Amino acid sequence: YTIKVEVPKVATQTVGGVELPVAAWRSYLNMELTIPIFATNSDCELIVKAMQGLLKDGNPIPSAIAANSGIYASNFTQFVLVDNGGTGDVTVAPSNFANGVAEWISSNSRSQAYKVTCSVRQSSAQNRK
Amino acid sequence: YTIKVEVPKVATQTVGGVELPVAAWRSYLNMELTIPIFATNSDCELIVKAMQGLLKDGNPIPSAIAANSGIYASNFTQFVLVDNGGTGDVTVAPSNFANGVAEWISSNSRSQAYKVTCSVRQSSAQNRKYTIKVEVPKVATQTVGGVELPVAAWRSYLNMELTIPIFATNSDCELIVKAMQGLLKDGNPIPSAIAANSGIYASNFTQFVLVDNGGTGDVTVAPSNFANGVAEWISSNSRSQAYKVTCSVRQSSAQNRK
Amino acid sequence: YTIKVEVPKVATQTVGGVELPVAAWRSYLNMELTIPIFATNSDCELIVKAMQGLLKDGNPIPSAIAANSGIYASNFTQFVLVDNGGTGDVTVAPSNFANGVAEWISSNSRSQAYKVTCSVRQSSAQNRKYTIKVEVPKVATQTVGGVELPVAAWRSYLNMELTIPIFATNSDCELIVKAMQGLLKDGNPIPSAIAANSGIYASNFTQFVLVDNGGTGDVTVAPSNFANGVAEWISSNSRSQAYKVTCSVRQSSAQNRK
Amino acid sequence: YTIKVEVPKVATQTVGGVELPVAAWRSYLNMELTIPIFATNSDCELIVKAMQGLLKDGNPIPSAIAANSGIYASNFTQFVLVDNGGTGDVTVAPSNFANGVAEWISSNSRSQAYKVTCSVRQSSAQNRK
Amino acid sequence: YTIKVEVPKVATQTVGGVELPVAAWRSYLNMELTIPIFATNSDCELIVKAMQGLLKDGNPIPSAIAANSGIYASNFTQFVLVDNGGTGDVTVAPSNFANGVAEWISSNSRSQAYKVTCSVRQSSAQNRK
Numbered sequence: 001y002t003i004k005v006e007v008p009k010v011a012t013q014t015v016g017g018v019e020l021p022v023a024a025w026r027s028y029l030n031m032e033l034t035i036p037i038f039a040t041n042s043d044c045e046l047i048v049k050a051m052q053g054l055l056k057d058g059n060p061i062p063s064a065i066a067a068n069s070g071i072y073a074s075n076f077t078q079f080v081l082v083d084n085g086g087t088g089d090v091t092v093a094p095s096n097f098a099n100g101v102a103e104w105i106s107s108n109s110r111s112q113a114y115k116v117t118c119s120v121r122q123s124s125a126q127n128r129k
Numbered sequence: 130y131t132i133k134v135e136v137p138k139v140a141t142q143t144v145g146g147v148e149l150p151v152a153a154w155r156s157y158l159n160m161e162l163t164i165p166i167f168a169t170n171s172d173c174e175l176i177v178k179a180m181q182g183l184l185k186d187g188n189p190i191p192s193a194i195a196a197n198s199g200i201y202a203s204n205f206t207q208f209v210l211v212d213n214g215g216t217g218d219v220t221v222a223p224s225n226f227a228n229g230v231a232e233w234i235s236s237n238s239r240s241q242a243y244k245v246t247c248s249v250r251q252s253s254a255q256n257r258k259y260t261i262k263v264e265v266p267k268v269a270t271q272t273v274g275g276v277e278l279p280v281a282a283w284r285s286y287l288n289m290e291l292t293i294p295i296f297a298t299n300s301d302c303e304l305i306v307k308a309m310q311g312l313l314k315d316g317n318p319i320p321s322a323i324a325a326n327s328g329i330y331a332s333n334f335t336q337f338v339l340v341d342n343g344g345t346g347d348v349t350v351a352p353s354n355f356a357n358g359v360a361e362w363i364s365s366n367s368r369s370q371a372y373k374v375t376c377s378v379r380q381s382s383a384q385n386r387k
Numbered sequence: 388y389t390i391k392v393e394v395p396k397v398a399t400q401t402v403g404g405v406e407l408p409v410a411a412w413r414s415y416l417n418m419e420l421t422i423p424i425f426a427t428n429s430d431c432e433l434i435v436k437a438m439q440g441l442l443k444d445g446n447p448i449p450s451a452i453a454a455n456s457g458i459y460a461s462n463f464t465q466f467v468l469v470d471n472g473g474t475g476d477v478t479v480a481p482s483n484f485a486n487g488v489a490e491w492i493s494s495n496s497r498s499q500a501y502k503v504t505c506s507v508r509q510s511s512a513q514n515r516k517y518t519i520k521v522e523v524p525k526v527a528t529q530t531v532g533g534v535e536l537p538v539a540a541w542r543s544y545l546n547m548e549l550t551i552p553i554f555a556t557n558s559d560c561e562l563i564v565k566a567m568q569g570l571l572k573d574g575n576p577i578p579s580a581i582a583a584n585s586g587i588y589a590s591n592f593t594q595f596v597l598v599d600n601g602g603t604g605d606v607t608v609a610p611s612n613f614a615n616g617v618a619e620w621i622s623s624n625s626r627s628q629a630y631k632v633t634c635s636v637r638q639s640s641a642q643n644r645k
Numbered sequence: 646y647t648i649k650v651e652v653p654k655v656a657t658q659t660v661g662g663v664e665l666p667v668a669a670w671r672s673y674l675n676m677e678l679t680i681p682i683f684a685t686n687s688d689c690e691l692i693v694k695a696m697q698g699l700l701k702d703g704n705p706i707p708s709a710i711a712a713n714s715g716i717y718a719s720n721f722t723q724f725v726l727v728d729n730g731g732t733g734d735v736t737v738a739p740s741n742f743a744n745g746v747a748e749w750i751s752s753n754s755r756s757q758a759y760k761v762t763c764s765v766r767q768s769s770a771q772n773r774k
Numbered sequence: 775y776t777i778k779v780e781v782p783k784v785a786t787q788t789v790g791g792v793e794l795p796v797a798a799w800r801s802y803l804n805m806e807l808t809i810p811i812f813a814t815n816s817d818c819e820l821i822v823k824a825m826q827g828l829l830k831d832g833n834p835i836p837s838a839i840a841a842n843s844g845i846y847a848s849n850f851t852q853f854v855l856v857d858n859g860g861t862g863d864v865t866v867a868p869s870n871f872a873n874g875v876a877e878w879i880s881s882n883s884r885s886q887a888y889k890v891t892c893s894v895r896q897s898s899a900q901n902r903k
Contacts, residue, residue, distance in 0.1 A: 077330065239773065278683045424755035680839075696836075711819050726827045727823050
């Protein structure tokens with residue numbers, strides 16, 4: 001799997017006196033996951049559980065990021081990307097499935113929107129990337 | 130957005146038979162829409178409203194298409210391009226007929242005006258082709274050399290090509306116009322997807338009425354394919370005698386979405 | 388003036404169907420008119436009257452066309468080319484049949500005579516072609532070497548090509564003749580524009596009866612296109628089975644208008 | 646805009662004893678108008694008003710010309726070019742719209758007729774000529 | 775005759791924080807008129823009448839311009855160039871007669887003013903341009 005996420009910072013920009021909604025900067029997340037062909041569905045569930053537990057609230061890895069510090073069909077559906085207790089949530093919706101790459105986009109201007117992509121590819125004879 | 134429509138010829142047609150050549154029995158519609166990335170949802174709703182007002186009954190373009198005619202000195206009239214409930218309406222007026230291209234612009238400066246152009250041509254021996262273009266601006270004031278000028282921050286572009294065989298009866302052209310009107314009706318999948326900056330994936334991919342004939346004789350299209358992300362609707366007919374609708378969306382360039 | 392007419396074949400025709408090949412179902416008429424810049428309105432009315440008298444019922448050319456025939460020794464007769472209410476009428480008489488071209492001239496000198504020529508030919512495997520030419524003079528006296536001679540100051544030229552498929556019935560040829568007669572009837576847009584040295588723009592661009600069948604079964608043509616200045620009329624049919632009329636006017640050279 | 650007007654002087658000419666109606670001479674008027682794309686309809690109305698006021702009766706420019714002295718669809722319609730109080734008026738009628746150039750011609754012989762042409766063209770990126 | 779007219783668009787411009795009255799853009803009108811030496815004063819009056827009728831309100835040529843659309847001594851005196859019903863009129867006044875070219879200028883700043891010029895010259899042996 002190759003999964004990419006983009007988080008923007010929404011703002012207004014003045015191009016010669018003209019106001020346009022843009023993103024001041026964007027943060028990128030890239031992740032690659034390799035699974036051997038011998039893996040049973042239970043092994044895949046264990047991998048998913050490990051990934052979920054890596055970023056649970058209160059653990060060192062998410063706590064470092066949260067303060068900018070260090071160490072001291074039927075599947076192409078809209079889902080909630082950012083949950084803020086029911087108010088201020090960010091929802092992405094499917095947009096494109098060209099070249100075997102699925103895409104999601106939040107309901108906003110394209111310049112101020114969240115972007116999520118996911119794709120699978122048989123990289124090796126015994127590994128699926 | 131890329132949209133394609135295929136309409137069958139009904140006059141003197143035998144149901145379930147073989148009718149050749151293919152080009153003598155089918156009408157083709159191809160629509161391309163370019164929207165800049167700076168447009169919000171409210172801009173998309175305005176673009177959808179402009180499209181709904183372009184093909185409304187009684188206006189020059191549907192009247193010309195429904196009667197196999199071109200643009201002449203009796204249907205060249207001003208019409209409401211964008212309807213906003215009687216307040217803030219955007220209307221266009223005849224402004225040019227040079228080189229065989231009919232043009233309408235709104236009562237604004239040349240840098241802040243809605244633009245409509247229409248042309249017809251005998252493209253082949255047995256085919257006639259309509260070319261239609263619409264330009265929708267985003268008005269702004271921009272300061273050059275310390276002086277303010279009216280400009281457009283960006284423009285949204287719509288182009289349409291319509292190919293009709295010479296054997297089509299006036300009723301066939303009326304069917305084409307009705308299908309065009311029913312494609313963009315409010316509440317249908319494509320305008321809803323356009324107004325929300327999204328695509329057609331699983332919950333808006335539903336069957337809908339393409340041709341409305343007062344309850345009796347209506348034409349309904351149902352989903353039939355989703356390969357490569359392109360959504361496809363067909364009617365209850367053979368693939369050679371059915372209404373076909375295909376829709377897809379991609380990112381053409383870094384500044385626009387098609 | 389450049390004028391084009393398209394006539395459909397009606398015998399054994401199915402309404403709204405597909406009929407192939409195209410060349411087996413349609414008749415074509417192409418007319419070119421060259422008028423010198425020195426002609427006034429009264430000269431144009433005389434030219435229009437000559438055209439009206441050329442295609443009047445009972446005359447050699449319409450009789451030959453309506454019966455698929457050529458020119459032979461029973462319809463080769465003299466006829467009134469220009470009618471001026473019994474006084475000042477211009478008549479032509481048979482004068483030549485060499486090389487397969489039938490010729491008529493008026494009772495005047497060879498330099499001051501109205502000229503009419505007609506020929507037929509099997510131009511293609513399934514098409515027959517009529518070529519018709521008319522020459523209208525402007526008589527004058529000109530002094531060369533101190534001696535007066537009769538000459539023509541200028542000549543107005545009319546040429547017509549008519550293509551008919553071999554499958555056409557006598558009734559189809561009668562329909563063609565009636566359409567030809569109704570095109571140039573007094574009060575219709577084209578003769579009115581020709582008589583006034585003008586074109587078809589907005590007020591003479593009106594619908595008119597092309598084929599007159601005694602009130603019942605009449606054919607009416609209505610405006611449908613005005614691109615590039617060319618005026619176009621069609622009947623209430625598909626573009627493959629309708630009567631089509633196109634008219635345009637330009638300046639061919641510094642001395643003539645076409 | 647590029648607007649041209651031709652005014653003839655009607656006469657009869659003897660070509661070897663043959664009388665022909667011709668124009669002894671013709672007067673030509675050529676005018677070019679440039680309008681920026683930023684112009685509002687009110688600006689265009691102001692320009693039209695200035696053009697009309699440049700040639701109003703009693704002003705220096707028309708008075709110099711009148712004595713040969715100096716300084717001391719729905720639009721292709723017939724209109725009156727010369728107004729002479731309802732008697733002796735000159736009316737032009739549309740004739741041709743080839744190559745994007747509209748033409749008008751008075752109801753006379755072509756050799757003794759008034760000629761009016763008008764055409765528009767995008768000469769520059771910000772100017773319409 | 776060679777007649778030129780300039781119509782400005784008045785505005786204020788900020789040069790490094792300094793306000794100056796300027797014209798954002800200018801529209802130019804150029805016209806050339808040729809009259810043969812055989813023309814009688816009546817012919818010149820007819821030419822002036824044709825020029826006036828070319829731009830009368832309601833005719834195709836001024837109506838196209840008004841909406842930016844197409845086709846579908848004793849003479850050097852001040853005169854009204856733009857008439858707005860007695861309120862908001864634009865008046866030009868004589869300024870210069872150098873090199874045989876007469877000039878008019880509206881009573882404003884030179885950067886925001888209307889400019890009218892007129893000059894006559896014998897271009898050919900039988901034509902006056």
